[PDB]
Structure 1
Amino acid sequence: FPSAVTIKSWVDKMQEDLVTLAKTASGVHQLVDIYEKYQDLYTVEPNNARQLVEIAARDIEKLLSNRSKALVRLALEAEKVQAAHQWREDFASNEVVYYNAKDDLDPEKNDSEPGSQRIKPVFIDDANFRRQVSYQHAAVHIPTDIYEGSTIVLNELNWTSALDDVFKKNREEDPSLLWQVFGSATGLARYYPASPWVDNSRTPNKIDLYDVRRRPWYIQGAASPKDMLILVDVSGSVSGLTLKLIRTSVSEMLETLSDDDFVNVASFNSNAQDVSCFQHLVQANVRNKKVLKDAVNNITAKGITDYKKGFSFAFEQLLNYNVSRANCNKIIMLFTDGGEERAQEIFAKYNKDKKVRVFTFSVGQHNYDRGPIQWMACENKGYYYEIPSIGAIRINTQEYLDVLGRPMVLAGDKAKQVQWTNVYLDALELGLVITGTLPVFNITGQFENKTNLKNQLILGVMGVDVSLEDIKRLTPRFTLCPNGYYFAIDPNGYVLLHPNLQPKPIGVGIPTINLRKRRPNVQNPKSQEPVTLDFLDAELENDIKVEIRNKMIDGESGEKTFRTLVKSQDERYIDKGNRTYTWTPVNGTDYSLALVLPTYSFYYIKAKIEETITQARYSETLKPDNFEESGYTFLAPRDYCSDLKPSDNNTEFLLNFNEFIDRKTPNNPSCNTDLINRVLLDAGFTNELVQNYWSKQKNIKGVKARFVVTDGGITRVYPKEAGENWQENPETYEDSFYKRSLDNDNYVFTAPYFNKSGPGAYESGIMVSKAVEIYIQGKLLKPAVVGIKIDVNSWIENFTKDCKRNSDVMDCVILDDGGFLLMANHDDYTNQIGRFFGEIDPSLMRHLVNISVYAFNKSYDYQSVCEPGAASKQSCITEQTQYFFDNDSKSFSGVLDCGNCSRIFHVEKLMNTNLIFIMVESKGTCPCDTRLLIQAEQTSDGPDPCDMVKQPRYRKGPDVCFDNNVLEDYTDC
C-alpha cells in the first residue's frame, strides 16, 4: 500500500490541475476585474436589516387594516338591513332574484323554480382571479342537501340582496380585494364577485360537499376556543349500527376543531379510560386529531353502562390545569343511545357552579329511554341532539357552535374583533389565503328589547380573503442575496410566510388505500385541513432557532447573529454559513415578521446607467440574433411591470422583454426602473466578459460548457450547443448551485442526477462553479457566480494517467461532500455516476460516517407526494437525509473489517475544493455486504405524536374570549 506522502503528491497534483482548469476557464478574476474596472455605472447601497423589517411590517399592518375596514362596513350594513326585515311567507307572487352558483350556464335551461328567479351573468375574464368573474352582482352557494325555495332560505335571499351594494363599494374603494363572503347560519354563502362554483351539483359525475358552517373561518368567527372532552359510551347496548354511527359522528366533530381548541376522547363501560396514548387534553392539530380518529375507529361495545364513572373521569380531566389548555370553553360531548340514570350527585359534586356545558347525543334507532340524557343536556346549560342515520351526522355535529356563541352575542360590541385564520387553500382555487372574520348579530327590536329569544344566536360570519401572494408583494427580495428571505410566524408557531411553504396540503402518517373497496362513481371527499407548517418544520431545527421563535412569538423585537446549518434548495447538501435574524412584531395583529440576512449581503449593487446609448447597447447585447457571439442568454421571469408577464417559457419571455424594451422608451412610466437597469447592467457586464475573454479560446480540451450567472436574472452559456443542455431555472434566485457557491468560499462541484431522463451524465459533464467576490470600498459583494462543465472523459484520462483502469486490486474514487460519486476507477461505477456512495459501497460509506469524516442529520418533509400502499398520489411525510463534512482534518487512515477481513483505506480531502479522494481495497477481496445506505426521500410516519404532547412546543393562545354570561337563557335542549 502506498505511503501517505505519495497519496499527498497525487491529490496535490489532481487538485492543482482541477483548480487551475476551473480558474482559467471560468474566468473569475476577469469578471472581478471588470466589476471593479468601472465602479461608475452603479453604486453600492446598504441593506439596513432593521429598517426593512419595520417597513414591511408597516405595509402588512396597513394591508390588514384595509381588509378589516371592509369587514365592519359589511357587518354593520348586514345588521341594519336584517333589523328591517318583514319575514313574508308568500314568495310566489314576489319572486326573489339571485344568481345561484353551481347551476347550468345554458340560457335554455328554463329552471322556473317557484318563488325564485335566476340570473345569467356575463363572466368576463379577470386578473387576481384565475377564473371568470362578474362584478355586477354576488353569487349564492346553497348546500346540495339544503332545499332552496324554503321559507327560511327565501327569506335569507330576500334581505341578503342588500349586501351587493356594500360589496361593490368595498371593491371600488380597494380594487385589490379578493373574495368577500357572508356565511349565513342557515347554510347560505353569498360572495362577491359572482363566479361559477368549482363543483356543480350533478352536471358532472362529481358532486360537492361544502357547508359554510364547517369552514375554518366560520368556526373561528362563530365562537371562542374550546376545551372539549368527547365522552363515548362503549357498553354492550351500543353494539351494532349505533356504534358505527358514533364513530363517524366523533370523527366529524373532531373535524370541527382548530389549533386553538384542546380535545381529548374518553370511553366508559362500567369503567372510564382514554382511547389513545394522550391521557390529557392536546392541541388538536392535524397529527393529534389523526391519532384520535385512528384510536376512535377501533372501539368495541362490551359491558354495562356507568354514567357516574364516565362523568367523573371527564370532569377530572377537565380540571387538570397542569398542561396547555384553551382555558375558555370547558364542554363535554356525551355520545350514547339511552339510559335510566342521570347521575345527579355527580353533577352536584363536580358542576354545581355550572362552569362546564354538557352536550348529549342520542345516536341510532333504539327503544331506550332518552329522558335522562335530555335532562343532562338542558340541566348543565347544554343542548340535546339526535343522530338517527349517516345523513344527520354532518348537520348535528356542527350545531353546538350556536350554543357556544350566546355569551359572545351578549357581550355586544366588545366581541366584534377581526380575527385571521391559519393558511389554507381557497375553495375557489385561488391558492394559499388567510381570511378575516367578523360575526354578525341578530338585532330585532333592539331599541325596545321585545323578544330577545332568537337574538342570542348570530346571523352569520363576515369574511374577506387575503392571498399569500399579496403579502409577498410587500416583502420584496430582489435587493437581497438569494440566501436572504422574509418569514412571518403565528403566535402558535405556524408560518404565514416562508420559502419552504408550499400550496400542497400537510401530510400526516403514511397513505394507505384499499383499491378493492372503491367504487368508480362515488366522488370521495378530498380534503378540508389547513396548511399549518411550524417554523421549526420549515427549516433545520436548531437550539438558537427555538429561542428566536419563542422570543418572537410573544411580541418582542430583537436581533441575533450565529452559525447554523443551511440546507440546499435541492435536498442533497448541507452548508455552514453565518446568518442574521432581525424580527419585529406587527402592531395591528398577532403576527411577527423576521428577515434572515447572511453576511456579504448587507450591501447590494444599484445600477446608475443614465446614458441612452449605453442602455441601448446593453439591451441589444441580450438579443437572440447574436447568441453565437454573446452566448445563449436566459432571463429571469421577474415582474418588471404588469405590461409583460412571466410565461415559464424563456425564449418567448426574452422575445417579449426585448420587444417591450425596444418599442417604448426605458423611461418606464409604470415599470420598475431598478430591475430593468440592473438587468441591463449585468447583461452588459456578462457580454463584455464573454467577448473579451471567453471568445479568445473558442475550444478548450477539458471544458464542455462555460456559464455565468449574476443577479438581476442574466444567465449566459457560451456555446449555443451547450445552451440546450442547460436544465437550470432561469430565475437565478432558485438556482441551488448559485446559493451553494455563495455560501462556500471555494470551488463547488455539483453532482449530476441519477436515473433521470435526458443527457445529464456524459453529454453535459460535471459542473464546478465559484462565486465572484469584489471589493468596491472595503465592502464585500458577491454579485455573480461563474463556472464550467468539465468533460467526464477528459477527467478520466486525467485520473488514470495502483490506481489503474479496471484495477482488480485497488479502488480509487472521488466524492464531494454529501457522499456522491464524481470519479471512479473501474468503468463500472463511472456509468452509475452521481450516485450516493452508500448505494454502491455501503460498508465503506458506513465506516466513513463512523470515523467522523462524513456527518449527517435527518429532517421531515411534511408536504410530499407519496404512493399509497396496501393495508394516484397522496400527501404524506418523507424523511430526508443530507451528508456533509464536519472535521477540519484533511487526511484519514484506517482499516475496516467485515467477517474476518481487513481492507486498508486512506481518504484525502482536496484543498480549496469540496471534493474528497478515497483509495480503498477492492470490494471483491472481501465479499461482505450488510445493507445499503440510502440517501433519498423515504416515506415515513414519524415523529411519534403522543410523545411530543408530554413536552410540546411553546405556544401563546388568544387572551380574550367570551363564555358564561349571566343573561344567557339556556332553556333549550
Structure 2
Amino acid sequence: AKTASGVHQLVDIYEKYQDLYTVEPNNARQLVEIAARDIEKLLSNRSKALVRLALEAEKVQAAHQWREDFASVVYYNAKDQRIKPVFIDDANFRRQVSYQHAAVHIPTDIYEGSTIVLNELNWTSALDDVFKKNREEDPSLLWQVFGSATGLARYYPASPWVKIDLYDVRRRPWYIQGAASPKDMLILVDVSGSVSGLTLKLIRTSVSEMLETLSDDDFVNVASFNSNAQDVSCFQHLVQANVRNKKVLKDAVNNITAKGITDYKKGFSFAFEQLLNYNVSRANCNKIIMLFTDGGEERAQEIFAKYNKDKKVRVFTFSVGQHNYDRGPIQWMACENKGYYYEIPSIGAIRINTQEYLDVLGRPMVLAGDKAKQVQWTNVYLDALELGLVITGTLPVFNITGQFENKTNLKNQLILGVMGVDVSLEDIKRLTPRFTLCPNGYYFAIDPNGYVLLHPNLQPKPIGVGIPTINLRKRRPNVQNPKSQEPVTLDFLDAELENDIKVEIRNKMIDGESGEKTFRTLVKSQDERYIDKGNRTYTWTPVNGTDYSSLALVLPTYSFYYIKAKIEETITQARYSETLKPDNFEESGYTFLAPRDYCSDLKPSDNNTEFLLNFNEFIDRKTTDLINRVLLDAGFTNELVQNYWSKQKNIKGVKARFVVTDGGITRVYPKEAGENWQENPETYEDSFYKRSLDNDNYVFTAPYFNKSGPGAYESGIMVSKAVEIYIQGKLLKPAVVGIKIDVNSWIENFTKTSIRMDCVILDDGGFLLMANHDDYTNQIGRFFGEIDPSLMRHLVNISVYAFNKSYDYQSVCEPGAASKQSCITEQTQYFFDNDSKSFSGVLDCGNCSRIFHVEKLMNTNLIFIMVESKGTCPCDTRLLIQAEQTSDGPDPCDMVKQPRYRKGPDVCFDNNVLEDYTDCX
C-alpha cells in the first residue's frame, strides 16, 4: 500500500510547493452567522413580493361592480376566449415559460361560463402588472400564484399544465395553512345500526378525505360513539398528526362495524373530555368537534349547557347519505354553537364539502386584519408542476370593500384567497457553500416542528407508509391512480442516527440562541454499508429574522482549515490545463472532472467526456475560486504520474492505481482498466472518499455481487489512505489515493502463505474479501451471515462487531400481496466496538463442536478468522441478512406516548365578540 501508492511521495508533493497556497480558516461560527444573514435576505424580498400581491389584490376587489351578463375574459385556460402564446425554453423552470401573460388553472369539476367563476376572472386580470413588475424588480423568481376561494389559480410564468387531473387548489397544503390557524380537531363517527349500507361507505370515505386537509400543526382523534363512546384508534388522546399518525387512523376507520343504539349523550361527554386535559401537548387553538351522524331525534341541550357556557368549542356537524330521517336537531346543533352544518349527498360531493370547513375558521382572521398578515411558510413538498422540493410563502387576501365608509357589511367576513410565492431549495443551496469544507461537512436547517430543510439526504420520492400492499385483482386497465398530495416531512431523529447527544442538540436548536458541542458519534456512510465512529464539531444559530428556521453546520474536527487557490504565474496553470486535455490519456490517465459550477455550463449525463471538452473550451476563451482550485489541483496529481507512476509501468500486482482529490479530479493510470471505474465522479457524493477521511489507516471495501454488471475478478477490491499534510502546525487532508488490488494475484500470496483449516479475510461490515475453500471465491462481497450464519450469530454474541438498526423512509420497494413504490425499510449496519485484537472462542452449535480464533489486523480494516470445520453436522439456523428488508415503521401507539419535544406557533386566532353567526343554515 505504501509502495503501490505514492502517498508518501504525494506528501512530498504538497510539502514541495510551499508557495501556491495560503491555508485559511473556517471559523464556523462566522460562516453560519454570514449564511444566516443571507437566508434572511432571501426571504426578505420574496416576503414583500407577497405584500405587493396582497395590497393591490384587495384594491381591485373594492371596485369591481359585479357584471352579470358577459358579451365582452381573455385568459389562457391552462389545460389545452382563449389565447395560445409563445414559449421560450428556460432552465430555472425546466419547462416552457411565457413571461407575458398570466395563466389560469381551473379544476375540471367546475366551469361553464358561470357568473361566479367568470366574474372573478374579470378582476383578477389586474394582478398581472403586479406579477410583471416583480420579475423586473427582481430576477430569478419562481411560481408566483394567486389561489382563490372558488378554485381559480393564476401563476406567472405561464407554463402549460402537466391522465385525469384532480388538483383542487382549495385543498392544497399551502392554501390551508394560510387560511386558518392550528386546530385541535376531534372527529366523531356515529356507528349505530342506522348507518349500515350507503351511509357507511361514505363516512369511511369522508373521514379519509377530511384528514388530508390537516397540516402538521393540527391534532385529531377519531372516536366512534355508540352505546358507549370509545376511541377506535389505539390512542385515547390527541395525536400530533404527522404523515404517519394520519395513516394509523385510516386503517382504523376502514374497519368499523355498524350496530347498536345512538345516544349522543355519552358521546359528547366523551368528546368534551378529550379536548381538555392540557397534559400531553395540543395546539391550544380553534377547537373543532366534528359529528358525522345521519340524523337523530335529540337536541342534546344538556351537554352544551354544561360545557359550552364559554362557547369556546365550535362544532361542525355533517349528515351524509340519503336517509329519510330528521335533519332537524343537527341544524340546531351547529347554528347555536358557531358551527356550519353541511350535507354530503354522495360520492363526488365529498371533495367540495370538506374544504369549505376552512373558510368558517377564517372568521377570527378576517376580524383582525391588521395583525393577521404575517408570512406563514409551509414546510416542504414536491411541486405539482415538477420543479423539485419547494417551500412556499403565503399571505391571505381579504374582501375589504366596506372599510372607513363602512356600509351594510354583509360579507366583510370570509376571505378571498391566498397569495403564494414559492422558493426552490436549490435557491437556498446556492447560498450555502459546500465546496470549501470537507465532504462530511454540510449546512442543515430545522423548522419549529422539528422538520428538515437542508439535510443532505432529503431526496425526492415521498415518505412513510406501512408495507405497501397492492392487489392487482381490484384495479382496472385504466384510471391514473392519484399521486399523493402528501408533503415530505422528514424527522431529524430519522434523518440520521439517534443519539443521546443529538437530542440535546435538537431540543436546544429548536428554540435556542447559540451554542456548539463537540463529541463522538456513529456516522452512517453514504449508500449505507458502514458505520464509522469519529468526531464532529457543530454549531447552531437561529435566523436573526424569522423563527421559522435555524441553521447548523456539521464539521469534521480536522476541517477548520482549507487550501486557498492562488496562481499568479498563468503559465503554470496553463500547463496544468494541458494535462487536463484528453490528448494525454496514455501520459496521465483517464482524468475525470466532477460536475460543478461556473458561468455557462451544463451537467454531464454520464458524458463527462463531453463536459470535460466543454470545460476545456472555457479557459481557452479566458486565455472564481473553484475555477482556480481545479487548475491548482491539476498538476499536483500530475506529478504523481510523471514522478512516481511513470517510473513503475505495470507491476506484478497493482492492476490499477487511482487518486481522488477534492476539487474534482480523479485519475486512473493504466486507462484501459480505468474506463471501468464504475463509480460516481462527484467527489462530494462519492462514497469511499468520505469514509477514507475518517479513519487514520487503510480502508478496504468489498464490492457487491452481480450488482448489475462486471464488478468482479475483473475489478478486484479497493484500498485507500487519506493524505495528511503538515503545514506549519496544522492538519489538512486534501487527497485520497487508492490501489485496486488484483484478486487472483492476492490469492497467489494468500495461497503460498498457506502452504508454508478454514480462514476468511473479512472486513468491518461482514463482507467477504477472500477465502480458501473455493466455494466462497464466487460469493466475494456477499455479507458473511448469508454464508455461515452459525458463526456470525455467535461471533457478535461474543463481541466485536455490533449493529444498529435504523429505519429509512425514502427507499423504494416492490409491493407484496394481500411497479415501484416507496416504503419504510430496515438497514443493519455492522461496525467495530472493542479493542484488544485477540478473540478466540470454542463454538458448540449443538451436538458438534468446533474452534474459533479471530484476529484483527493492525493499522487497517481487517478481521481474520480461523474456524475449523464444515464436514461435521450442519447448523442451518437462520440467515443474518444485510441489505434492506422491507418492513414496518416503528410502533406508532408507543411513539406517541413519549411523544417528541417541540414548540407550536404563536398566533392562534379565535373568538371575537364581533363575528356574528347567523349564516350556517
Deviation at 1:641, TM superposition (A): 2.4
Deviation per residue, 1:402-422 (Å, 9 max, x gap): 110000110112000001101
Deviation at 1:28, TM superposition (A): 0.6
Native 8 Å contact 2:225 2:262 kept in 1 = yes
Deviation per residue, 1:555-574 (Å, 9 max, x gap): 32111000000011120100
Native 8 Å contact 1:635 1:715 kept in 2 = yes
How far apart, in 2, do the equivalents of 1:923 and 1:91 lie? 90
- 1:806 is aligned to none
How far apart, in 2, do the equivalents of 1:844 and 1:236 lie? 60
2:524 to 553, 567, 575: 567
Deviation at 1:360, TM superposition (A): 0.6
Native 8 Å contact 1:637 1:648 kept in 2 = no
Deviation at 1:390, TM superposition (A): 0.6
SS at match of 1:190: strand
How far apart, in 1, do the equivalents of 2:55 and 2:723 lie? 59
How far apart, in 2, do the equivalents of 1:798 and 1:647 lie? 41
How far apart, in 2, do the equivalents of 1:532 and 1:885 lie? 33
Native 8 Å contact 2:853 2:867 kept in 1 = yes
SS at match of 1:463: strand
How far apart, in 2, do the equivalents of 1:510 and 1:643 lie? 43
Deviation at 1:126, TM superposition (A): 1.2
Deviation per residue, 1:908-955 (Å, 9 max, x gap): 011011111001012222311100100111111120111111101111
How far apart, in 1, do the equivalents of 2:56 and 2:605 lie? 42
SS at match of 1:193: coil
**Structure with more of its chain in strand, by fraction:** 1
Deviation per residue, 1:111-131 (Å, 9 max, x gap): xxxxxxx11110111121011
How far apart, in 1, do the equivalents of 2:385 and 2:748 lie? 59
Alignment of 1:680-829 (within 5 A): 680-801=631-752, 810-829=757-776
Native 8 Å contact 1:563 1:578 kept in 2 = yes
- 1:804 is aligned to none
TM-score, structure 2 normalization: 0.98
Native 8 Å contact 2:586 2:671 kept in 1 = yes
Deviation at 1:261, TM superposition (A): 0.6
Deviation at 1:648, TM superposition (A): 4.0
Deviation per residue, 1:64-98 (Å, 9 max, x gap): 111101001101000011111110101124xx110
SS at match of 2:807: strand
Deviation per residue, 1:162-220 (Å, 9 max, x gap): 0100001111111111001001001101111111011xxxxxxx110111110111000
How far apart, in 2, do the equivalents of 1:297 and 1:542 lie? 37
How far apart, in 1, do the equivalents of 2:604 and 2:128 lie? 34
Deviation per residue, 1:353-392 (Å, 9 max, x gap): 1100000101000110001001001110011000011111
How far apart, in 2, do the equivalents of 1:925 and 1:708 lie? 47
Deviation at 1:645, TM superposition (A): 4.6
How far apart, in 2, do the equivalents of 1:956 and 1:756 lie? 45
- 2:74 is aligned to 97
- 2:566 is aligned to 608
- 2:805 is aligned to 858
How far apart, in 2, do the equivalents of 1:648 and 1:181 lie? 36
Deviation at 1:750, TM superposition (A): 0.8
Deviation at 1:647, TM superposition (A): 4.3
Taking a change above 3 Å as real, the CA distance of residues 316 and 939 of structure 1, as seen in their structure-2 partners, is: same
Deviation per residue, 1:567-623 (Å, 9 max, x gap): 111201000111011110002222410000111110000111111211110111111
Native 8 Å contact 1:647 1:653 kept in 2 = no
SS at match of 2:684: helix
Native 8 Å contact 1:853 1:885 kept in 2 = yes
Native 8 Å contact 2:604 2:610 kept in 1 = no
How far apart, in 1, do the equivalents of 2:741 and 2:653 lie? 6
How far apart, in 1, do the equivalents of 2:563 and 2:229 lie? 69
Native 8 Å contact 2:380 2:453 kept in 1 = yes
How far apart, in 2, do the equivalents of 1:218 and 1:463 lie? 8
How far apart, in 2, do the equivalents of 1:705 and 1:645 lie? 28
Native 8 Å contact 2:841 2:853 kept in 1 = yes
Deviation at 1:702, TM superposition (A): 1.9
Native 8 Å contact 1:639 1:646 kept in 2 = no
Native 8 Å contact 1:89 1:151 kept in 2 = yes
- 2:89 is aligned to 125
SS at match of 2:572: helix
How far apart, in 1, do the equivalents of 2:679 and 2:571 lie? 32
How far apart, in 2, do the equivalents of 1:269 and 1:642 lie? 68
Asked whether 1:299 is paired with 2:256, we answer yes
How far apart, in 2, do the equivalents of 1:131 and 1:452 lie? 45
Native 8 Å contact 2:826 2:885 kept in 1 = yes
Deviation at 1:960, TM superposition (A): 1.2
Deviation per residue, 1:120-153 (Å, 9 max, x gap): 1101111210110100011000110111410010
How far apart, in 2, do the equivalents of 1:922 and 1:250 lie? 62
Native 8 Å contact 1:507 1:864 kept in 2 = no
How far apart, in 2, do the equivalents of 1:148 and 1:733 lie? 54
How far apart, in 2, do the equivalents of 1:606 and 1:148 lie? 65
1:320 to 257, 261, 277: 277
SS at match of 2:523: strand
Native 8 Å contact 1:860 1:879 kept in 2 = yes
How far apart, in 2, do the equivalents of 1:148 and 1:827 lie? 76
Question: Number of residues paired by the alignment?
Answer: 915
How far apart, in 1, do the equivalents of 2:673 and 2:409 lie? 78
SS at match of 2:625: helix
Deviation at 1:453, TM superposition (A): 2.0
How far apart, in 2, do the equivalents of 1:421 and 1:943 lie? 26
1:58 to 25, 37, 47: 37
Native 8 Å contact 1:639 1:645 kept in 2 = no
Native 8 Å contact 1:142 1:148 kept in 2 = no
How far apart, in 2, do the equivalents of 1:678 and 1:664 lie? 16
How far apart, in 2, do the equivalents of 1:148 and 1:798 lie? 82
- 2:779 is aligned to 832
How far apart, in 2, do the equivalents of 1:910 and 1:325 lie? 55
Deviation at 1:646, TM superposition (A): 4.7
How far apart, in 2, do the equivalents of 1:570 and 1:145 lie? 45
Asked whether 1:72 is paired with 2:51, we answer yes
Native 8 Å contact 1:339 1:369 kept in 2 = yes
How far apart, in 1, do the equivalents of 2:268 and 2:83 lie? 54
Deviation at 1:688, TM superposition (A): 0.8
SS at match of 2:11: helix
Deviation at 1:724, TM superposition (A): 1.6
TM-score, structure 1 normalization: 0.93
How far apart, in 2, do the equivalents of 1:85 and 1:785 lie? 69
Deviation at 1:844, TM superposition (A): 0.6
Provide the identity percentage: 100
Deviation at 1:793, TM superposition (A): 0.5
SS at match of 1:372: helix
Deviation per residue, 1:674-732 (Å, 9 max, x gap): 11111011111001111110111101112110000011001000011111220121111
Taking a change above 3 Å as real, the CA distance of residues 98 and 224 of structure 1, as seen in their structure-2 partners, is: same
Deviation at 1:269, TM superposition (A): 1.2
Deviation at 1:643, TM superposition (A): 4.3
Deviation per residue, 1:827-874 (Å, 9 max, x gap): 110111001010000011111110111111110100010111111011
Native 8 Å contact 1:644 1:657 kept in 2 = no
Native 8 Å contact 1:855 1:885 kept in 2 = yes
Native 8 Å contact 2:402 2:412 kept in 1 = no
SS at match of 1:82: helix
Deviation at 1:254, TM superposition (A): 0.5
How far apart, in 2, do the equivalents of 1:451 and 1:281 lie? 42
**Structure with more of its chain in helix, by fraction:** 1
How far apart, in 2, do the equivalents of 1:341 and 1:629 lie? 92
Deviates more, 1:722-731 or 1:380-389: 722-731
- 2:120 is aligned to 156
- 1:110 is aligned to none
SS at match of 2:41: helix
How far apart, in 2, do the equivalents of 1:510 and 1:172 lie? 49
- 2:364 is aligned to 407
Deviation at 1:800, TM superposition (A): 1.6
Deviates more, 1:640-649 or 1:610-619: 640-649
Structure 2, unmatched stretches of 5+, are none
Q: CA RMSD in A?
A: 1.1
SS at match of 1:512: coil
Deviation at 1:797, TM superposition (A): 1.2
Deviation per residue, 1:803-822 (Å, 9 max, x gap): xxxxxxx2101111011000
SS at match of 1:242: helix
